[PDB]
Ligand binder design. Sequence first.
Ligand SMILES: Cc1cc2nc3c(=O)[nH]c(=O)nc-3n(C[C@H](O)[C@H](O)[C@H](O)COP(=O)(O)O)c2cc1C
Ligand SMILES: Cc1cc2nc3c(=O)[nH]c(=O)nc-3n(C[C@H](O)[C@H](O)[C@H](O)COP(=O)(O)O)c2cc1C
Ligand SMILES: Cc1cc2nc3c(=O)[nH]c(=O)nc-3n(C[C@H](O)[C@H](O)[C@H](O)COP(=O)(O)O)c2cc1C
Ligand SMILES: Cc1cc2nc3c(=O)[nH]c(=O)nc-3n(C[C@H](O)[C@H](O)[C@H](O)COP(=O)(O)O)c2cc1C
Ligand SMILES: [Mn+2]
Ligand SMILES: [Mn+2]
Ligand SMILES: [Mn+2]
Ligand SMILES: [Mn+2]
Lengths: 463, 463, 463, 463
Amino acid sequence: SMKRLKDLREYLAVLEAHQDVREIDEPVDPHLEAGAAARWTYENRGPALMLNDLTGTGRFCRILAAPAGLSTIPGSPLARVALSLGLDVSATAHEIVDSLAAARTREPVAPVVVDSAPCQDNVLLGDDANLDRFPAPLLHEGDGGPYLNTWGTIIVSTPDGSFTNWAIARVMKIDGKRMTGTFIPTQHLGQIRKLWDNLGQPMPFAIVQGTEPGIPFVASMPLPDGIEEVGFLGAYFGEPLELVRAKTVDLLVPASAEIVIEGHVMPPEYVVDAITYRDDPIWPISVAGEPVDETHTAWGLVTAAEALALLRAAKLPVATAWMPFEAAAHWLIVCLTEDWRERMPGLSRDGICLRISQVLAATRIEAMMTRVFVLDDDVDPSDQTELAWAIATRVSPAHGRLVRHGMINPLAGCYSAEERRLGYGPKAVLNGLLPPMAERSRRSSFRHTYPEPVRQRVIELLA
Amino acid sequence: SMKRLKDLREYLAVLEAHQDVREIDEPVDPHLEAGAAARWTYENRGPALMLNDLTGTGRFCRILAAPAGLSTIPGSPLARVALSLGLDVSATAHEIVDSLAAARTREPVAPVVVDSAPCQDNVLLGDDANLDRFPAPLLHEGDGGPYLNTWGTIIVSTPDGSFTNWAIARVMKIDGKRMTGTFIPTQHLGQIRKLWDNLGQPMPFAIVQGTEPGIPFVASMPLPDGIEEVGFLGAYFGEPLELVRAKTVDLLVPASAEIVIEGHVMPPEYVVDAITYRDDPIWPISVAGEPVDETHTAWGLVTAAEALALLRAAKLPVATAWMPFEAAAHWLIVCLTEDWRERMPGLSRDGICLRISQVLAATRIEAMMTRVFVLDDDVDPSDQTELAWAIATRVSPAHGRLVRHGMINPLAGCYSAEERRLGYGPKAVLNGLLPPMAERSRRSSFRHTYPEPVRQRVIELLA
Amino acid sequence: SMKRLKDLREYLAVLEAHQDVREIDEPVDPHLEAGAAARWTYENRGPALMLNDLTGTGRFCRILAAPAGLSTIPGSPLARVALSLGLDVSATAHEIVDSLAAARTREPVAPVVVDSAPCQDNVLLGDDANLDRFPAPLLHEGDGGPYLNTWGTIIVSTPDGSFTNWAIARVMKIDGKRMTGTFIPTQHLGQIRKLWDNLGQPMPFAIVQGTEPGIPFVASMPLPDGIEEVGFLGAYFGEPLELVRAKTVDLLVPASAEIVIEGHVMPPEYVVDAITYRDDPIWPISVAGEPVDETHTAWGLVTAAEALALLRAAKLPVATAWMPFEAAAHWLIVCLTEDWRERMPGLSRDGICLRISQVLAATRIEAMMTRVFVLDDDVDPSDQTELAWAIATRVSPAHGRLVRHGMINPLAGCYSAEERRLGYGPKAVLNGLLPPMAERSRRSSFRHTYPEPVRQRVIELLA
Amino acid sequence: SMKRLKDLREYLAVLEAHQDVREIDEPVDPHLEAGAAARWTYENRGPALMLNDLTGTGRFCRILAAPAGLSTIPGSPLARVALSLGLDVSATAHEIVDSLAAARTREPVAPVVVDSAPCQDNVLLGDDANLDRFPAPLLHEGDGGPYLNTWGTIIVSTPDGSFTNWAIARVMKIDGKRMTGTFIPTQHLGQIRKLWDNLGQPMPFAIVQGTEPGIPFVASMPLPDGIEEVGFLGAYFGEPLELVRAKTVDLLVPASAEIVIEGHVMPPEYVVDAITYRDDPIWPISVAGEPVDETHTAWGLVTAAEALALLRAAKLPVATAWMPFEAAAHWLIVCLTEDWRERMPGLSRDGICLRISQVLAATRIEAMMTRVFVLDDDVDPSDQTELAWAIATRVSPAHGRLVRHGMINPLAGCYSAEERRLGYGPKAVLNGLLPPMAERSRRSSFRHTYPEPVRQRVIELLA
Ligand SMILES: Cc1cc2nc3c(=O)[nH]c(=O)nc-3n(C[C@H](O)[C@H](O)[C@H](O)COP(=O)(O)O)c2cc1C
Ligand SMILES: Cc1cc2nc3c(=O)[nH]c(=O)nc-3n(C[C@H](O)[C@H](O)[C@H](O)COP(=O)(O)O)c2cc1C
Ligand SMILES: Cc1cc2nc3c(=O)[nH]c(=O)nc-3n(C[C@H](O)[C@H](O)[C@H](O)COP(=O)(O)O)c2cc1C
Ligand SMILES: Cc1cc2nc3c(=O)[nH]c(=O)nc-3n(C[C@H](O)[C@H](O)[C@H](O)COP(=O)(O)O)c2cc1C
Ligand SMILES: [Mn+2]
Ligand SMILES: [Mn+2]
Ligand SMILES: [Mn+2]
Ligand SMILES: [Mn+2]
């Protein structure tokens, strides 16, 4: 019973119905103002913004800010994430990660190729395919230049055409025909590029902006080597994604795109050969920084869903997994089922944390996990207060800590300059599991400490 | 320029003007319902409750629930704390702890004795002084009996009459004439009681309920041995507190009280000799449990103010100190001034954390501090999200941790059964200080990453 | 200027000249007595033993116990190791590991094939090739059966015949024609065996006993994948090793052997097809246990030499490396040169320990290192007392510890049952490096604290 | 059945009978040579030295070097300690500490005052009482001046004359009439001196050299406040010590002394008022530095005996305690009895280490213990090799460590400059206890792994 939104226009019409998108008709400068407007929106939990008029390009190309920021919908802060993933506006943190992890146990669904798509209604080729026709937002004061890709998907195939990877990575503008980005060897973009460099040939690419809202979530997901994002998207929604042939390169791109940038990566510079776009195009942006933005609501969230799927595939009794937004995607919380001891009869609390550390260490997400807290499932790790309370009251100030040293996230802040320079530092697994305890010995709150007739009577007097 | 509220009636009239107190006219049972109503209020950030009609005693004695819970006043969650301490309704976490710590550098102000007070308008003596005339609330399902004192102040003097201690401690009802409580040797009540036991004489006492709202905050404050709470209250408000002579014991009690219970502690049982009360008495309660209640807003908060004063008296450059409510008064956050290196030229980051640990370890609050995080003052430790972000991004997963073993808080949850039974366990000091860094290299947010004209322009478009 | 001993007879004639081998003419039972005689010898630093008469087989096959135990030679406890490696009887711990590590920088020297060898003077084929003709020592009370290989070398080749591995592993007797051993996947024997199992063919093998004394040291050495022990032995001694063709299998074996057991490993059982031996054969044994035996003098020592070579190949300024015998080959000591800061200008003490941990973690010896201590080279890590003094006085009781979790040595004792069962546990790197300090501020001894004329004068009065 | 040696002449006659003292008749310079001769002796395990002829004072006053260094007596390295404490020349480490700890459970024995003593055969008063008559040894190149007291005992009484403390502390010569030393407030000399400073009066003192050999051991012992060393010595030997009245001060001094220096400590300088000595006086020295000297054989050893007595007084099942000489008196080893679980039924291994840490932390020796290792009593902590093997194989590389921060030993080397400057740093308790295990699963050696008839048979063949 999924409610898949098929393009960005549908996504925006749903947000508009819930009063969660605002149109700005006054001119906004892509030089710092658009980025500042996005930050204000994330930090104040404002509606997503449609910037209808940008200095330099006017009303030609709109900008969507905070596409998956925290929502204004009352009682539903995850509504943009939930709607993007075809779920109810009020889907909980656990329902979201559980729906993604459930799709990892399903067979991939091959996409379908359509003859035409709105993303090719306007086609710019040759000298007309120039990025100077579109906004070039300078998102933060100290950036090296305009970041053209922050929320769009980069599409590349291996030379044999047997495998296609979709990924979100930052791409900076050099000039009207050229862009650049960093190609990390631990990422699938970098791995695929090394195959094109070995054959001494430019790698064809496509960057798509403003696709259906579910695509950037799966493009940020650290799926295993050899699992295509498009097949996973298909298994997740229970139907094939519709793709259209790119105009100047042998690649298939989402037919739901607002804009398609096509070209080749030279031996690392992206060279633009064609730009295609649908009428009145919308270019979404994501302005990374402190909590809470799409680094947290999309990347950290889909990473938690992948961790949940990997831990369950190792037969661990994991109720849920979550990357708390307030910890800026530095932490993973792993919650065990109440009956984990019945399910894993041979391990102590320390033993199951050792096992979790061993399983996570064998995966491609292990370097991101600066800290993993292992807790009981009477804690909602998406509830900031309950999570902080559980860590303070259940994790020993000294013991129950398992430290591993190895590869680290170079963007994580909790490392010394020497650890960053070596790319070698500590990652911890912290044990916050309790011994077997009665509910009333580990809780003291309205829901957990009073009989149902007493709570009912209080609710009738006060609610 | 203090705005001291002189009794509970004034406090309640101020909360009523800000729509932060609600009257419940339907009957409420002191058997679990009153406690459940208090928990619902804390956990939902509801108005303080005036329970006007209690099963068993009717409308005789009202109950005030959540006297200093988080406020409903828009943008002012600490308003009940701020008003209780004579400050503006919108006083910040830092203004509150700074006002308390500033009073620790001032000379005590002796109280004044008045001939009469509303708290003695009604006097019950002999067989009439029976607690069965007042509500006996069973605050939580598993409690040993009714907790008569949770927010009132216990008053005792040393045998020589040279020193008087005011403290909040829990007192349980045994029957109509007798109550009990635990007398901890590390607390001033217990220390004073041991002096009365050495002379083989019953210790006279008084318990006051519903005094002016500033008294329970100073009665929860862990002031040094030999500093009277009444003298500190006087220095804090800049004027003498008015006291009245108790009717059957040689003690002075706050003239602002709603109820006064007088008696002697026998060799530990409290025996009631007299009960005095003002017309239409109000008996406030505090229902301890998970965050956020007065364990956090009063006890942890005044403990943070005492830590701030002790650290500043040791000439440490401490900007602020705070006990985060979400960590259930298990954690202390110490924020250093931006120029701490200029103020302490001979210490590294590790060195200043060593010094903080050494100073705190010599004080009477050291056993409460399961964790102390040392951070820079660009972090507001009362902001849940910014605090969690600073810890995740600035505290190493492995290093910068100073562990001390010793006396522990027996109520803290993060200890093993063996550590609790021995009263011996770990307490940590964690270093989250940064090396010297430019604002734009340690922050990425609206306020810190954009020029003032860009922010102004965004505020005019969106706010 | 090597002094290579070409067979076991030469090795024994050299030990006899230094009164470091004793002949036992009384009968000794291979059932526990031979093993007990070996343990007494290791633990009392006795001469190596030649057991001339064994219960069951008489004077047919002699047994050599403690072949490389600590020596009785005055002032030369490492003499058996030094002589085995072609060095002077008085070669120091550092000269030994440095000579082995220097050979890792040299090109391999291919062996030479000889037409005949003393190891084939007697040939047993078919039903005559029966292990019941030779001693079957039960080395420890609780062993599963007789350990036939403890100091001999197992020789196997890959199916293509392109690579030959020589290794010491324990082999237990089942009966007269069959033996067994554990084939670990991290070891080259196990890796080569998996290639024979994939082709569905029995793996040919040879076990050689009593070769020239340098071979078991290189057969215990954890050389990288693809480096043949025979080529390394050749580079080490500066000349080709002489090999002879095995009688029933297509393998080349050391011509210096006392006994050659040939056969095939079935899908894990070793099946004996031929036994060849020189007149009056000697079967050496190694009886593993507490310090000090060949587990320590050979395996831990050659592992320290390989660590020294790997650290120097990563351009680290390592003066020496050593596995202290008293720590039962659980610890590695890494000593940095006095001018390491001049050689590595960009790292602090913590930084260089991080780098050492990172380099060691990428090697095949990392799981053996339960602890690595990083020290200055004013400490001789082969001097028990000076080493214990340096650790106690230079390693912080709390900080300077880098913990990594991963694969562990299943035979190491410092792990819990859960860590052993998972094969996952902690390994530490401890920083004992000093800040820049004058000799007289870090030492207080005869050699370091008195002027040369004062020491000379004292030596003339006392020595 | 004690064999108490009543003076230094008897001690030296016993060492001479065991060929453990050597006379040097050639002249030796007290400027560095005597100290260098002492260091050579400790480090080479040489006989104690009698320096019969010193440059500057000739044959007047002899010097005894290495009075309690490791002995040359075959198989009896602790013989100087054992003889000093009235025990058999072959008394083990455990017999020594057990004999000292047993005396802590006995009532003190008051001394007896004798009318005359050999230490007053020669009396120097007034201007004749000049230290320039005796050697002034410069013990190490960088010392501030000559150390006149290194092995003698400082005697002081409280102003009321109710308590007398005997202690070894270093005393440096200023000139012929004046000396100086540091008066630490945690030591009994410093505490007693503060009482004399409060009354504004010079503290009378006496320094005795060359007393009976048991006195410097008890003078180095950190006995509790209010326990006199003389009473303990009396309880230890089972008889009263004989004291003689000092000539110019109201103090009692050992009648067995070689030299007595009397005077007053001025407001810290020692001023000499009288020197008394027996014919042909001997002035013993102790030259502190690296292991092994009297810092280790006396101070660390008697500290281990006091720890054993304190742990047993807290009803802990401690088999033995020892301060390993190789760890330079930085470490304490605590060995529990094999049946400790039967004796302490309610604690886990971690629990008993917590308890040991808690008990030790309440004592006056806690700051000296940089590390405490808790082990089973199948380990002899005085056996260097077995101790290193037990720590390497039984202490986890990561867990089982209890860190406490507090007062530290300013002379300990394992602290940073900031920890030393603050006098605040880490002290650890490490858990090396095993779970219940069969002897053959935790040992592998001659004594533990072979049946008694097999060992007997091997001993008859080899010993
Ligand atoms: C807003 C946003 C921006 C991102 N930017 C980057 C980036 O510049 N580089 C990068 O390596 N990963 C970035 N990621 C994370 C990757 O998309 C993620 O690691 C993904 O799994 C990569 O695809 P792959 O698993 O096929 O290699 C970003 C994610 C989000 C949501
Ligand atoms: C709601 C509330 C209840 C409290 N209950 C107790 C209690 O039962 N026992 C206790 O020792 N401290 C309790 N405290 C903390 C003490 O009031 C606090 O330690 C105070 O400083 C004690 O007074 P003293 O410093 O004069 O010893 C409570 C505090 C609050 C705010
Ligand atoms: C006395 C002795 C016995 C040994 N027994 C074993 C054994 O049974 N199994 C094992 O894996 N390694 C054992 N080793 C260690 C291996 O020989 C060593 O890991 C060697 O490097 C293996 O050869 P490879 O590096 O070619 O895999 C022993 C070493 C010595 C000196
Ligand atoms: C060779 C030697 C020299 C010593 N020198 C000193 C010293 O200079 N200062 C000191 O405080 N303790 C020194 N000690 C240790 C003290 O004697 C020891 O702490 C003793 O218990 C002090 O006496 P008290 O317990 O009565 O205070 C020395 C011990 C020995 C054996
Ligand atoms: Mn991918
Ligand atoms: Mn008080
Ligand atoms: Mn090999
Ligand atoms: Mn004393």
